[PDB]
Structure 1
Amino acid sequence: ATDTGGYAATAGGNVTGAVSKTATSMQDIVNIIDAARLDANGKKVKGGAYPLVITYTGNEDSLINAAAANICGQWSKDPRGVEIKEFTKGITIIGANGSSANFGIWIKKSSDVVVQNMRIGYLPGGAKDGDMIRVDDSPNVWVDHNELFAANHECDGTPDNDTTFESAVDIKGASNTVTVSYNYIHGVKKVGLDGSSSSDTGRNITYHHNYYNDVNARLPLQRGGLVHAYNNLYTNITGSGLNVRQNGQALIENNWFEKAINPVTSRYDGKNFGTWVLKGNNITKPADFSTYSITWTADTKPYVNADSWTSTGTFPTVAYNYSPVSAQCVKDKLPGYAGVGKNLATLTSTAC
């Protein structure tokens, strides 16, 4: 099946002729991918010779725990990450229950990639692009059921005072269709952008069933295109949530917002404000702000906040087939489906 509940339509490496391999470490993954590029005669095949399903059984809790104890010592270390560059035969990286990684996954110019059940946290190298997950010029990518975390904190003396830790899920370039679902993202200052600059506008991204807790900003920082955010649990947002920019369009439905500052806004450009269609969220009118502790702030440049909590534009017909649960149900149940070790469980109406 290729249904991801969002714009990405992929089965990753779970296709016909897929070869399954077990990675017990970061290096194993690197080696497995390199080998997957060679045909029967040892010659290299552009985009990969065969589809892969890599089960990662490694555990790096020691690194994570050491890092959690010395937060400000991470940014200056060398970044660590597996690069999945120009691999298009289809690939899935599934963490085994109990596995953990203190390294990221950087997807570049690939297609049909699925990253699931990975517990990634406290990555070193925030000053040198130490992203947890990066999707660059890569369409049909599905980031599902992962736990991405660090500390929602900025240490003193870091370059640009923004490099204590890098992003959880950055999407940029021609990553035309992407689905980010069932992830448990917590303790992350910059969750993820959708377009690296003002000129990097476009893409159709879906964020569904994610549980955000204690995050500062970018859920996402959207530049153009379309974003469909449904059934997400947004709690303890310390800066801003969905920042719809460069004329992007967003459909924000059936989500639960709580203890959030500027949950839906269009700021920092001073122009080309994006639009949003609000529906089915726990907040239905400004009266609810007080109830769910939703505060708003201004910006030094022209900006637009959804403080009137009204739709400011339109949204095209949602191409795919999805069945959202109610905002209340996500609030009640979501924490038990999002993240690692939930056996890729999905929240259905029957569970409400």
Structure 2
Amino acid sequence: GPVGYGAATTGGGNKVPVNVATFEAMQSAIDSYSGSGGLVLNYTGKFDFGTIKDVCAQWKLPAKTVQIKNKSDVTIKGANGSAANFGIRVVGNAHNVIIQNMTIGLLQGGEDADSISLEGNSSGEPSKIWVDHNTVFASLTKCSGAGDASFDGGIDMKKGVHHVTVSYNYVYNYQKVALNGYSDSDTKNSAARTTYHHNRFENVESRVPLQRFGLSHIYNNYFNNVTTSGINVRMGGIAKIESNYFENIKNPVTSRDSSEIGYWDLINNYVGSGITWGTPDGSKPYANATNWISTKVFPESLGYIYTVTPAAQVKAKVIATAGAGKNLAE
């Protein structure tokens, strides 16, 4: 089950799964749902990614996104071998949601190509979310005319989404991995409480995660070939960064590009070879954890029990267990 801030998440629980073979069948089942009591969706579709002949075709097409809006007690689970060319959004007064074993790739929409996105709005803020054992991939290619946005966020939350575990996910060939707070004015995000653990982040550019405000616990994650920046903590946010495995990563632990810096509590991190550092372009304040020194003590109890993989073993453990098609191995 979930470990960390999303530990109370049960989603649809033991309800008999509803088999959904398509994007539209999934949305339809969500729309018909009363909104609480439990819904379990078994996604069986097998999108053939080889039908996408040009990575740069995607950004100009409209997004394909399943919405869970103001509905609670939901499990979206990919069957073994299932693959989606659509993303998933949880928005508003929506609670107790599991998104699990989905393979989400090369989405249409550009700046609108969000893979898994959790968002507060005027109606409420999502909580008790477990994003677990998914594989999310796109391309690092910067398409002609696309601006900064040939693809969009991998596993994103904003506007006060709270109590969430992001675990055992595999994110690769992805420019912008994980947003947490969408801008420096997203002050509702001080409520955010996120555990990121046992994720595999490989061949990615930045936002691993980009944290604005709130509290996070980032542990037992494996980072490799992260080319711009890794954990970026901003706007008074505090991250307990514990027993991760870092290699071939630029700016692995940083605070940059916000009007105000964020802080970190560092313990037992495995720091391998290929660590580089850079100074950000611009005027805003910044900090690079070059000597791996804590800038703040994590200010409160996590309020949950967790088992730590020895840091040096995290690479092998994460490679073995992270992503879809792994039978949810832990």
TM-score range (shorter-chain normalised) is over 0.9
Partners of 1:28 and 1:332 in 2: CA distance = 37
User: Is 1:164 aligned to residue 150 of structure 2?
Assistant: yes
1:19/1:51 contact within 8 Å kept: no
Unmatched segments (≥5 aa) in structure 1? 38-47, 284-290, 347-352
Task: Identify the range of structure 1 (252-261 vs 191-200) with the bigger mean alpha-carbon deviation.
Answer: 191-200
Provide the residue aligned with 1:188 in structure 2. Answer: 174
1:19/1:50 contact within 8 Å kept: no
Provide the residue aligned with 2:123 in structure 1. Answer: none
Partners of 2:229 and 2:51 in 1: CA distance = 30
Unmatched segments (≥5 aa) in structure 2? 121-125
User: Is 1:13 aligned to residue 24 of structure 2?
Assistant: no
**TM-score in terms of structure 2 length:** 0.93
- Write the letter of the residue equivalent to 1:75: W
Partners of 1:104 and 1:332 in 2: CA distance = 29
Following TM superposition, by how much is the alpha carbon of 1:19 offset from its aligned partner in structure 2, in angstroms?
A: 4.3
Following TM superposition, by how much is the alpha carbon of 1:272 offset from its aligned partner in structure 2, in angstroms?
A: 2.1
CA distance change for structure 1 residues 152 and 14 in 2, over 3 Å: closer, same or farther? same
- Write the letter of the residue equivalent to 2:13: N
Partners of 1:246 and 1:165 in 2: CA distance = 25
Task: Identify the range of structure 1 (248-257 vs 166-175) with the bigger mean alpha-carbon deviation.
Answer: 166-175
Cα distance per residue 1:80-137 (max 9 Å; x no partner) = 011000102x01011000110000001112101100000000001114x120110012
Partners of 1:33 and 1:268 in 2: CA distance = 38
Provide the residue aligned with 1:286 in structure 2. Answer: none
Partners of 1:282 and 1:219 in 2: CA distance = 16
Provide the residue aligned with 1:112 in structure 2. Answer: 96
User: Is 1:50 aligned to residue 37 of structure 2?
Assistant: yes
Following TM superposition, by how much is the alpha carbon of 1:199 offset from its aligned partner in structure 2, in angstroms?
A: 2.3
Partners of 1:153 and 1:327 in 2: CA distance = 32
Identical counterparts, % of pairs: 44
1:36/1:50 contact within 8 Å kept: no
Partners of 1:333 and 1:5 in 2: CA distance = 16
- Write the letter of the residue equivalent to 1:33: I
Cα distance per residue 1:34-80 (max 9 Å; x no partner) = 2222xxxxxxxxxx15311110001111xx2232x311111000100
2:65/2:86 contact within 8 Å kept: yes
Q: Quick one: which of 290, 306, 312 aligns to 2:295?
A: 312
2:36/2:71 contact within 8 Å kept: no
- Write the letter of the residue equivalent to 1:193: L
Task: Identify the range of structure 1 (312-321 vs 100-109) with the bigger mean alpha-carbon deviation.
Answer: 312-321
Q: Runs ≥4 in structure 1, deviation > 6 angstroms? A: none
Provide the residue aligned with 1:224 in structure 2. Answer: 213
Task: Identify the range of structure 1 (6-15 vs 211-220) with the bigger mean alpha-carbon deviation.
Answer: 6-15
Provide the residue aligned with 1:214 in structure 2. Answer: 203
- How many residues were matched structurally? 317
2:89/2:116 contact within 8 Å kept: yes
Q: Quick one: which of 2, 21, 24 aligns to 1:24?
A: 21
Partners of 2:141 and 2:179 in 1: CA distance = 18
1:247/1:272 contact within 8 Å kept: yes
Provide the residue aligned with 1:237 in structure 2. Answer: 226
Measured on the aligned residues, the alpha-carbon RMSD in Å equals 1.2
